[PDB]
């Protein structure tokens, strides 16, 4: 055998196969790590940018409206619903069986005031904004897939699995509501 | 000892698991050692080594 490039092991010597797996496993560690790093860098570059995450916290104030209408207000990219309900409205909203609801919750829990109903106005199904004064329950209707919300914002018909989310809020004296 | 050393050489699934584990642990150990020596080489220059850190006025 030519020995300019490689010198043989003495005849009658056991194979170096098991030594060679160990040297090779060594560099395969690094190859796998490099693949993982590059792929994860590419994937995480699509995650939210530092400036996007910067604008993710703030609160605003509000005023007042007529007894029976709603006005949408603004946040991050998300509307917020306000609806001061009447006495017969509360009677309607306090006569629904909790068991029959797919998300059992009473109106009293959701509201911090007997008549002022404040709730994030984004459909829990796929993100559309539910149209007010529409539906089969006098609450809201989401046009996108037919999700019906009652006056308290509880889902009653459609694909949506949750009721409209109540955010943290409070009053100041009578007409200044902090969300 | 011999059990794992016989599984790694005889079944490629075990060898691939061994490669994945080695990548994980080796990359963490180098990240750790590289940060230790970085900390040793930059004593006093850290954000939390600032004496007045916390009193702007």
């Amino acid at each position: 055998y030519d020995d300019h490039n490689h010198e043989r092991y003495p005849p009658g010597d056991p194979s170096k196969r098991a030594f060679a797996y160990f040297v090779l496993s060594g560099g395969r560690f690094v190859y796998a790590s490099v693949l993982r790093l590059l792929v994860l860098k590419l994937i995480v570059s699509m995650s939210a940018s530092k400036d996007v995450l910067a604008l993710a916290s703030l609160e605003v104030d509000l005023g007042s409206i007529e007894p029976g209408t709603t006005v949408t207000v603004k946040w991050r990219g998300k509307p917020v619903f306000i609806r001061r309900r009447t006495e017969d409205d509360i009677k309607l909203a306090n006569s629904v069986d909790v068991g029959s609801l797919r998300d059992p919750q009473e109106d009293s829990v959701r509201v911090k005031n007997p008549e002022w109903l404040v709730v994030v106005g984004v459909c829990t199904h796929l993100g559309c904004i539910p149209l007010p004064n529409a539906g089969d329950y006098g609450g809201w209707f989401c046009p996108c897939h037919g999700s019906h919300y009652d006056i308290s914002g509880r889902i009653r018909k459609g694909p949506a699995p949750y009721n409209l989310e109540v955010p943290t809020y409070s009053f100041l004296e009578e007409n200044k509501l902090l969300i | 000892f011999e059990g794992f050393y016989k599984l790694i050489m005889r079944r490629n699934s075990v060898y691939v698991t061994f490669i994945i584990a080695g990548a994980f642990f080796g990359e963490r150990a180098v990240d750790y050692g590289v940060h230790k020596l970085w900390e040793r080489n930059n004593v006093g220059k850290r954000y939390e080594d600032i004496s007045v850190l916390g009193q702007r006025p």
Binding site: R36, L40 | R11, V16, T17, I20, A21, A23, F24
Partner: peptide, 28 residues
Amino acid sequence: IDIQAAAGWGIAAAAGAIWVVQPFGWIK
């Protein structure tokens, strides 16, 4: 060679999932 191989490759896949995605904190 069929059930043992399936178990081994499932173990390898689970380990690779734990290695690529590292949710150390999702053990809750």
